[PDB]
Amino acid sequence: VAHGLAWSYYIGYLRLILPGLQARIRMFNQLHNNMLSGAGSRRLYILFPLDGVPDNLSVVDPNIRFRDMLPQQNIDRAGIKNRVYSNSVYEILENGQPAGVCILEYATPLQTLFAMSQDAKAGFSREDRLEQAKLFCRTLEEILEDVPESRNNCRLIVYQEPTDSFSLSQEVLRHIRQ
Amino acid sequence: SVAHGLAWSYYIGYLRLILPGLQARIRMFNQLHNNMLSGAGSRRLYILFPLDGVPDNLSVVDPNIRFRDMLPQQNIDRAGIKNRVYSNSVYEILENGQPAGVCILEYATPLQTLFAMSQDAKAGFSREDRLEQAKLFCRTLEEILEDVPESRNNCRLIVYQEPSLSQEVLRHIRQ
Ligand SMILES: Cc1ccc2c(=O)c3cccc(CC(=O)O)c3oc2c1C
Numbered sequence: 173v174a175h176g177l178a179w180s181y182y183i184g185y186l187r188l189i190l191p192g193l194q195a196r197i198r199m200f201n202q203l204h205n206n207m208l209s210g211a212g213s214r215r216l217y218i219l220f221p222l223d224g225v226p227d228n229l230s231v232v233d234p235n236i237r238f239r240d241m242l243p244q245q246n247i248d249r250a251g252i253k254n255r256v257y258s259n260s261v262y263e264i265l266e267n268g269q270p271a272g273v274c275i276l277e278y279a280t281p282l283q284t285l286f287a288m289s290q291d292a293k294a295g296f297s298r299e300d301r302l303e304q305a306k307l308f309c310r311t312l313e314e315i316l317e318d319v320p321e322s323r324n325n326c327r328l329i330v331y332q333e334p335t336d337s338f339s340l341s342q343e344v345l346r347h348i349r350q
Numbered sequence: 351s352v353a354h355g356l357a358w359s360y361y362i363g364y365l366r367l368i369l370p371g372l373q374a375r376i377r378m379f380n381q382l383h384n385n386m387l388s389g390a391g392s393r394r395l396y397i398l399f400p401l402d403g404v405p406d407n408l409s410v411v412d413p414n415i416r417f418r419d420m421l422p423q424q425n426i427d428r429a430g431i432k433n434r435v436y437s438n439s440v441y442e443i444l445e446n447g448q449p450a451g452v453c454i455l456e457y458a459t460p461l462q463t464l465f466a467m468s469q470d471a472k473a474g475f476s477r478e479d480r481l482e483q484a485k486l487f488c489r490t491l492e493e494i495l496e497d498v499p500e501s502r503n504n505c506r507l508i509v510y511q512e513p514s515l516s517q518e519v520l521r522h523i524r525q
Pocket residue numbers: 179180181183184185249251252356359360361363364459460461462463
């Protein structure tokens with residue numbers, strides 16, 4: 173199931189959104205004294221926690237600080253027709269210092285995976301959901317690897333949360349640094 | 351299968367966002383265009399799903415399906431996806447050379463995904479395989495809509511196969 177879900181995420185969102193990302197950064201930077209930086213901050217980072225319903229990003233971590241919206245993106249495929257999309261820019265702290273600035277969001281298909289799992293008749297366990305989550309990521313990673321213009325503009329950030337000291341900020345930083 | 355997750359994502363990712371505000375958007379439409387819609391048959395989101403990828407865009411697919419107007423936009427504002435603006439389009443469906451029906455009409459966006467999947471260099475699949483998937487998608491989507499009345503009565507999945515669409519649409523509006 174998660175195979176077609178990763179494809180619809182790519183086809184139905186990442187394809188529409190990536191190509192104009194850089195231009196929107198350029199603006200953002202004109203208007204915020206070059207807050208985005210070089211290379212690290214030139215990507216759309218998609219968060220995919222493994223372990224449903226992660227904390228929303230404004231509250232998840234005191235070291236992940238919202239700054240501002242990029243300028244909106246207008247789309248006009250023969251969709252759909254006219255659509256407006258938003259993306260959000262976050263300051264990422266390490267040791268009390270601004271260590272990174274980036275565009276960051278959760279993968280919407282989490283919501284579908286969760287909703288699937290919660291359905292009364294055909295819902296399924298946490299373990300079965302994790303198996304699907306892993307399959308979504310593996311499949312999305314493959315798609316992106318095959319598409320250099322897409323891959324140069326975004327990175328899937330996949331992580332597991334221990335219920336048992338987890339900092340999402342340190343995870344994002346490690347990716348941003350790689 | 352893959353089309354089952356796809357159906358759930360069209361529902362969770364689009365129909366849930368769009369149907370709740372539809373009637374509000376229709377009423378305002380009617381007021382702006384002399385009650386051009388309302389007849390009950392004129393107040394659902396009609397979603398075309400040709401079982402046959404890449405169906406000609408609606409404005410050009412059939413002389414009997416003629417673009418009239420856009421609904422007022424639907425603004426959405428959730429967590430994660432902050433501001434989005436969605437559009438939907440209203441079509442006049444002529445029969446016998448004359449307007450016979452008016453509706454809100456669009457292609458299901460997941461057609462584009464079953465097609466792209468099909469078309470992949472590796473683990474892509476044939477037309478004969480992509481069709482079985484399209485079938486699974488339609489069935490799964492019609493099962494999902496059934497469990498939630500608020501949604502069901504506000505959209506119809508028009509599924510069709512080459513042996514006139516405008517005649518295929520009116521039948522639905524009439525049902
Ligand atoms: C242009 C395009 C193409 C494919 C999809 C899609 O598979 C898909 C699957 C599930 C949910 C959506 C969201 C939507 O229809 O806006 C999807 O959007 C798509 C869009 C917007």
